[PDB]
Amino acid sequence: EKGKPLMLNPRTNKGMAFTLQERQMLGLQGLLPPKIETQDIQALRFHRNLKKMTSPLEKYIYIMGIQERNEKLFYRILQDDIESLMPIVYTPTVGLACSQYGHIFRRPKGLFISISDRGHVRSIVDNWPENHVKAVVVTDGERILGLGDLGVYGMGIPVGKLCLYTACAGIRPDRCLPVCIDVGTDNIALLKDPFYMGLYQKRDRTQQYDDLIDEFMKAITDRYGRNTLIQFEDFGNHNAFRFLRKYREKYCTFNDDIQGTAAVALAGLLAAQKVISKPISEHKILFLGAGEAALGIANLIVMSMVENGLSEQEAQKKIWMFDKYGLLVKGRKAKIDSYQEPFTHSAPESIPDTFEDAVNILKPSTIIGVAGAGRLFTPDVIRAMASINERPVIFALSNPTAQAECTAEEAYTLTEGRCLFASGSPFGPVKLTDGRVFTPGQGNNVYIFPGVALAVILCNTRHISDSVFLEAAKALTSQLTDEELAQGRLYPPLANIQEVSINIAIKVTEYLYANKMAFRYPEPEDKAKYVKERTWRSEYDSLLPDVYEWP
Amino acid sequence: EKGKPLMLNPRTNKGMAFTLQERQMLGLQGLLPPKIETQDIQALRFHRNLKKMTSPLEKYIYIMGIQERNEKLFYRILQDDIESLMPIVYTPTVGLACSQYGHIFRRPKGLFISISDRGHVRSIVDNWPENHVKAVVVTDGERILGLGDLGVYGMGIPVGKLCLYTACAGIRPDRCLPVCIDVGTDNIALLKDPFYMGLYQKRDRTQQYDDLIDEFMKAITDRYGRNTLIQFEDFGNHNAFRFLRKYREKYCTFNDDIQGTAAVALAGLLAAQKVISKPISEHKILFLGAGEAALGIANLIVMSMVENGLSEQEAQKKIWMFDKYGLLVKGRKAKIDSYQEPFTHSAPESIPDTFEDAVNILKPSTIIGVAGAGRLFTPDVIRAMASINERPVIFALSNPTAQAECTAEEAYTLTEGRCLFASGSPFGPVKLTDGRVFTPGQGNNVYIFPGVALAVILCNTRHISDSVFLEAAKALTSQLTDEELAQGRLYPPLANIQEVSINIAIKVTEYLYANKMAFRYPEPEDKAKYVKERTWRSEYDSLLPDVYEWP
Amino acid sequence: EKGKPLMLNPRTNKGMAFTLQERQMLGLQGLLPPKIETQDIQALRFHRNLKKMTSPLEKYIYIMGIQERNEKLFYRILQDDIESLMPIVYTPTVGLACSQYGHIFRRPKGLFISISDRGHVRSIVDNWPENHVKAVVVTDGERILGLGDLGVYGMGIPVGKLCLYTACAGIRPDRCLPVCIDVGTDNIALLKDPFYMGLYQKRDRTQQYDDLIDEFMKAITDRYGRNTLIQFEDFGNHNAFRFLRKYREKYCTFNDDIQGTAAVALAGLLAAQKVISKPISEHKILFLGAGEAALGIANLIVMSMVENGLSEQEAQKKIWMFDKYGLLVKGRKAKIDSYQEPFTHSAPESIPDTFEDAVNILKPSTIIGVAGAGRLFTPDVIRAMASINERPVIFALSNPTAQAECTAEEAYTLTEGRCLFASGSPFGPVKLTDGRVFTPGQGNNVYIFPGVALAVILCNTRHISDSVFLEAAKALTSQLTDEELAQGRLYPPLANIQEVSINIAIKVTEYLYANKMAFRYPEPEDKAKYVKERTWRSEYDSLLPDVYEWP
Ligand SMILES: NC(=O)c1ccc[n+]([C@@H]2O[C@H](COP(=O)([O-])OP(=O)(O)OC[C@H]3O[C@@H](n4cnc5c(N)ncnc54)[C@H](O)[C@@H]3O)[C@@H](O)[C@H]2O)c1
Ligand SMILES: NC(=O)c1ccc[n+]([C@@H]2O[C@H](COP(=O)([O-])OP(=O)(O)OC[C@H]3O[C@@H](n4cnc5c(N)ncnc54)[C@H](O)[C@@H]3O)[C@@H](O)[C@H]2O)c1
Ligand SMILES: NC(=O)c1ccc[n+]([C@@H]2O[C@H](COP(=O)([O-])OP(=O)(O)OC[C@H]3O[C@@H](n4cnc5c(N)ncnc54)[C@H](O)[C@@H]3O)[C@@H](O)[C@H]2O)c1
Ligand SMILES: NC(=O)c1ccc[n+]([C@@H]2O[C@H](COP(=O)([O-])OP(=O)(O)OC[C@H]3O[C@@H](n4cnc5c(N)ncnc54)[C@H](O)[C@@H]3O)[C@@H](O)[C@H]2O)c1
Ligand SMILES: NC(=O)c1ccc[n+]([C@@H]2O[C@H](COP(=O)([O-])OP(=O)(O)OC[C@H]3O[C@@H](n4cnc5c(N)ncnc54)[C@H](O)[C@@H]3O)[C@@H](O)[C@H]2O)c1
Ligand SMILES: NC(=O)c1ccc[n+]([C@@H]2O[C@H](COP(=O)([O-])OP(=O)(O)OC[C@H]3O[C@@H](n4cnc5c(N)ncnc54)[C@H](O)[C@@H]3O)[C@@H](O)[C@H]2O)c1
Ligand SMILES: O=C(O)c1cc2ccccc2c(Cc2c(O)c(C(=O)O)cc3ccccc23)c1O
Ligand SMILES: O=C(O)c1cc2ccccc2c(Cc2c(O)c(C(=O)O)cc3ccccc23)c1O
Ligand SMILES: O=C(O)c1cc2ccccc2c(Cc2c(O)c(C(=O)O)cc3ccccc23)c1O
């Protein structure tokens, strides 16, 4: 393009970083302020402005405003201050922004697909400008993290997620497509006000919803290829869990809550087996809550035990689960699903109804809380957990902070610094009365899903297996240095996630090429250089055409 | 255009007012939320949101945000609530927004012309997309109303001014071009910070500034025609006053502060001569401050007296002026300019140094304050003014409110409701202890410059005369009904300015065709229908192409 | 535009005349052959290629091919060799090309409007890209000069005509719009073959045809303005003659056959009155054939006599007409139209049935043949014409050459060089046996309609009067030098028509401003400079944007 469109397009826009020659010979002279800046000056200006701001919503509005103007500047700002701005971009700020401000974006981002557009989804998909997209993030709006049902307003969530894809992994922004599929909303507040921009109907729970999802996946893979990575995001637990099982084999789909969270938990455990002398195989594990997330975590733990020489049937005997009714045992009154069968064992002597006595009798070395029904972990639970184990491992993986079973202060005060605590929700460092300030391990999916997504995209993988996340967990555990392990950190520092994500991608890429899951040939000689070439870089590219004089 | 560009262009964007057929056959299906709205729903949504907001800056950011997305919706919102949103758009909110937020706009508006771009201004002008523009507003940034020197940040002022052109007069938005000519800045705050987007030099006061203005006017009239209306806005008093004299004859230029303010003051006086039985000719007038603004007001008053039968030399004897040094009289110690000569008369007996004794001895029937050095009108001045005259006329035309000579409460309390008070600055209604709440006449240029601009544009006028504003003042006085005159209102209500402006245009148009100042031929048979057809209307236009089946 | 579109657009295409810098910085590097040429080299190449060609059809195909590739080069080639290439472009070559080759053009030229598109003509007109067009040429296809009914294939005729507008007058190519209105065809050859691209119906002679013409004119003047010049070209004689009368007052329409031919004939007579001592007023004129063309010529001759002091009723007594039945006299058996009444006089003594005895008895000084029924002028007619008059004036204005009444050889051999012969059809020089080679005056409309069209366009004239063509005829007679008059030439040389046309425009422009028929104000001080600035010039314009370095 030339002239004004070149400024309007966020991909090609440089702002006042257009050099004088580019302005003069591209038609931008007089349309821009006289100052000529670099990308550093532009980044410093926005960093100072963000530092002046005091609330996450103001920062979110500011950064999402600069995203629509200059994308390279936006990602430069993100990568410059990724640790601080990542909560502003993805969680929990974007959900709250969708709740309060509604629709913030001034430009068409992604595709809105209705239940009224059934039978014609391919026509909608054909409207997207970019011909090659590699990653698709789909939102229903039903279950926003901590905000509930937001209807069609939950479109900012995929945008915030794809921002993390580009900022951490390096996936090209134009290869990403955010999609919102709206079938109504259940909350009455949006159904009542006349200015809600979605359908004025309750959420469609009939077969039309399933058919719409089928048609959408078929259309998107028809236009963009069978290896397109499709991620179902903020669907209902029922919908997301069953959709992953349905589309797992036919399409390239992976779920962060089931699989990314399992990878993060396994990485935390593999780091704990380095902090503590005893390995992962020896120590018994107890799960609070039995569900698809708990089953995924336990399956991945069993895989990790198996690759270390333990028999699969023997490895499963170590993992214990605590359902809502009680300990998951043979002969239990409540029904046990087929998937929960491997981890259901012969009943112990006590057969305890309460989780506390289950901890007391089973003597679990590791405790993992995924139930997310509240503060299920109690001070009695934690002191008991300390009683059996010299260095107990406590995981509170359910988020938001309200749903988390344990708090960092509770874990580090009930146990006088002996425990290893890892939680999905962010917690401040705990300062004991004696001293020895402890920062609790905070493991979120952003460690896993960017690098895994990049590795899957680069290798043209069509089916993502469970062991891909095992390799991702091992890779993530690998970047921890011995000094950090001495400090007791379970996860790599979040300030340098990019170098983490790329490294993870490398390892995953190698695995994908080792087991014939990668369809991009010829095989790279070395995977590190291969992935490092492909990552998108936010540096501006000169638009000056080559000018010379003929000999 | 088709597809995504159709949404990105503010001129052609409809938002969710795109009908389903337009979305389907224009490529917008899936790029817009499923809801289909009308222009009324969109206007109500923004009106409610603006009503929720509590500060002028928030409202300004919101409305200028919707301007960049949908221009027809923006002007519909303005015309719906013109009285409330006009201070938000033009004064004093836009200057304060430029002061605090800097550059708000996310899209290229107008042209930035540097002193470093001398010799190549035509190349800059050629970069503007629209081939036909009728009105150009030029800002220097030197003298923002109440904020001082803002440098290149004073670009929002022409945008806010052109918004009033389109909202009140009905001039097409694409016919307007805002231009900022930046030659440096004098304030050290902008010269010190590294993120100022202008030139890092003090304001260029040399001959290069004059040559740049000459070159800019030549280039703009070369590209867009000699009848292009060019308005110098927020220049320094010296620069603006001398530029109007220099370019008045060669180009189509008019100045609101010199000529629009004079028209508003004369309209107020012509309305007072209806409120008070005695006419304009009889009553003596005293001016506080002698300058180009005061000279313009006095010249226009003399013209009004002359058209009513009074001799010009005899009419000039009635207007008196009070310079900074003292009463403007023969033999005065201080120099008297050539332009101030007609209103300089033989000295009275007292020859008073102070303004108070000048009022006491001259017995002025009307007092007009344009000096703007502060609260020059004192309680003693106002009680004296009441002493001579049963119904004194007091004008405090200098703005901002700080620079205004008098306050509405002072005028209406020192004079027990007898005075007629008109001021440029807005004042709340005055409630006396006895009762009889008085609203002070508030006459701003927005009465005059939209209608006069529309009339000049429609008739292809090349030279705007002084008597055009005399006709505008008479027209503005005409819309006042007898009920409003009984209420004591000097100006028409501001809530229905559009019907005022069009009416003014009509009258001005007639005058332009009466005196061979209009170059658009053939002459319209009736001017009212002629102007009413031409005004831009904010109603959306269907983009459905005509579809039929051949016989 | 930039890159490949810049080459594809004929308006902006330069071919290999793009300089190396333009190619490099406009994206054309590698898309063009390495050679860099000028406007002269390109013109010389095409001139040599045309000189190699031997038939008019090959030349027509070649030049109309270069028109679609480079318009500036095409018009440079035309203006370089206008006399030779004008018959190739307009007449009689383009009609024969439409007859044989059908549709030659590879690009959309003009608009095709059907009788099946009635009720929606404005939708068709809105499809034309150019927003400002000044001249519109409309063809029906019914009466092609010498080829008969060609149906929709007669679309090349307006294109060839507008080529003459641009080449001779200098009207901008993008201001011209060729329109073909097809209502069927009468010839069975086109109705029979399955590949005819028009309607498969006989020509619509019902009221729908008239309504379609009305709707088309209304739509075209609605989109492009009331002063748009619309020219009905190659309509049937009935249709064209009645349409000129119907739309003459309401729209800006003029007809070459009625009015241009009359202007050319009057110019020839005014040149003859310089070649022969006696003036136009003295000499009696006899017309062969009485019709709208003959009535137009006679009316214009009467106007010329009147402006020279002769009374209108007395001037009309000199012009005589010979209808099909016989001499046009009082009491004639055949009906006489209202328009033919002024030139119908009291019967002479003979009242001759044959044209020959009419010449013998009336003793006409001038004879004009417009009937076009064949070789109506006979050797007996010409020898009789020589018998009465020492230097007879013979005009054979009907074309093609087959329809012409007289031949140059017949006129110059039956009269031993004494006669002055002017004909519409082209004739070679006549070489008598004694010697004194005589070239016959060849007066075609191309003398008149380009200059008159340019003058009408420049002055924004809304109604073209009859006396405009009187001024055009006088102007055309004026360029003849005394040397050419001594040579006996009735018309200026055709090799320098451009300097003729511009001159004609000048004079016409002056007349339009003298009689308040011109609506473009302010009035130019001198009309010559005014028109000379406005003429389109075929010189290439550099596309290099201005590049400089800031001080
Ligand atoms: N100015 C530009 O925007 C520009 C210029 C040149 C090339 N490209 C891109 O290079 C691509 C060529 O593909 P390739 O030769 O690199 O294939 P590849 O063999 O290197 O990689 C295999 C797959 O990985 C995809 N991929 C590679 N890098 C990616 C990234 N950073 N983010 C998301 N997906 C990525 C590729 O699209 C490809 O499908 C073009 O299709 C085009 O998308 C873009
Ligand atoms: N996106 C994430 O961060 C993420 C990912 C995975 C898991 N989780 C967490 O997992 C937990 C639930 O996920 P899920 O997939 O298992 O949902 P689910 O619907 O599949 O099942 C939830 C399980 O929790 C058990 N449970 C509920 N209340 C209990 C109680 N008071 N006492 C004991 N057990 C109880 C139930 O037996 C049930 O099986 C939540 O904390 C959730 O936030 C979060
Ligand atoms: N979809 C569109 O945007 C669209 C469609 C048709 C016509 N137009 C406009 O109509 C114009 C035709 O001019 P005209 O026949 O009306 O001239 P006119 O004789 O009616 O008026 C004379 C002058 O007044 C100008 N003018 C008229 N209305 C104006 C307005 N509301 N705001 C600012 N200037 C105005 C005109 O540009 C013209 O120069 C086109 O040049 C084009 O600008 C726009
Ligand atoms: N844009 C507007 O709203 C507008 C328009 C016209 C005039 N004004 C007002 O006119 C007044 C000045 O405008 P100007 O064009 O005359 O400026 P100016 O520079 O041309 O001259 C100002 C005049 O004010 C006189 N003066 C200054 N201080 C005085 C004092 N203490 N006592 C008596 N006289 C004093 C001076 O003699 C001087 O002649 C200001 O209130 C200004 O705000 C405002
Ligand atoms: N690169 C370009 O193509 C380019 C650049 C600048 C201006 N222009 C043209 O100049 C026009 C400005 O009009 P103006 O100021 O000259 O009006 P004008 O006062 O000079 O003339 C009056 C009328 O004559 C018309 N006209 C003038 N010259 C003509 C020509 N050679 N052929 C056909 N019609 C002609 C004009 O369109 C106008 O309507 C623009 O509308 C635009 O059409 C074109
Ligand atoms: N485009 C041009 O070059 C042009 C322009 C004007 C006139 N003409 C010529 O004018 C002549 C006809 O044009 P028109 O407008 O008068 O058509 P028309 O239909 O209006 O009338 C033709 C006239 O010719 C008369 N006529 C026909 N045959 C005759 C005959 N054998 N003897 C005597 N008179 C006869 C008839 O009385 C009739 O009135 C043709 O030569 C035609 O080519 C040509
Ligand atoms: O990158 C871009 O396309 C970009 C485009 C711009 C266009 C015009 C003016 C400033 C621009 C800036 C800098 C900038 C800003 O961006 C912002 C903002 O975004 O709020 C505010 C500014 C305030 C004062 C000065 C500069 C500011 C940009 O960076
Ligand atoms: O006109 C336009 O082009 C326009 C374009 C839109 C595109 C997508 C969504 C809403 C749009 C709205 C409505 C709208 C808004 O415009 C805004 C806003 O402007 O802040 C906020 C909204 C919040 C919730 C729902 C609708 C909102 C528009 O009007
Ligand atoms: O003006 C133009 O856009 C133009 C565009 C051209 C593009 C490619 C090659 C020649 C071009 C020529 C020159 C040219 C020709 O044009 C033609 C032709 O037109 O038949 C034939 C050629 C044969 C040999 C060499 C050059 C010839 C042009 O002029």
The N- and C-terminal alpha carbons of chain A lie at a distance of 30 Å
CATH architecture of the domain at 4-258 in chain A: 3-Layer(aba) Sandwich
- CATH third-level topology of the domain at 4-258 in chain A: Rossmann fold
Portion of residues in helices of chain A?
40-55%
General form of chain A = globular
CA radius of gyration of chain A: 25 Å
User: How does the major sheet of chain A shape up?
Assistant: 6 strands, parallel
User: For this structure, what is the CATH class of the domain at 4-258 in chain A?
Assistant: Alpha Beta
Strand order of the largest sheet of chain A: 7-6-8-9-10-11
Structural class of the secondary structure composition of chain A?
Answer: alpha/beta
Q: In what range is the share of β-strand residues of chain A?
A: 5-15%
Instruction: Please work out how many helical segments of chain A DSSP would assign.
Output: 23
Question: Of all protein chain pairs, which has the greatest interface, and how many residues does each chain bring to it?
Answer: A-B, 46 and 46 residues
CATH superfamily of the domain at 4-258 in chain A: Malic enzyme, N-terminal domain
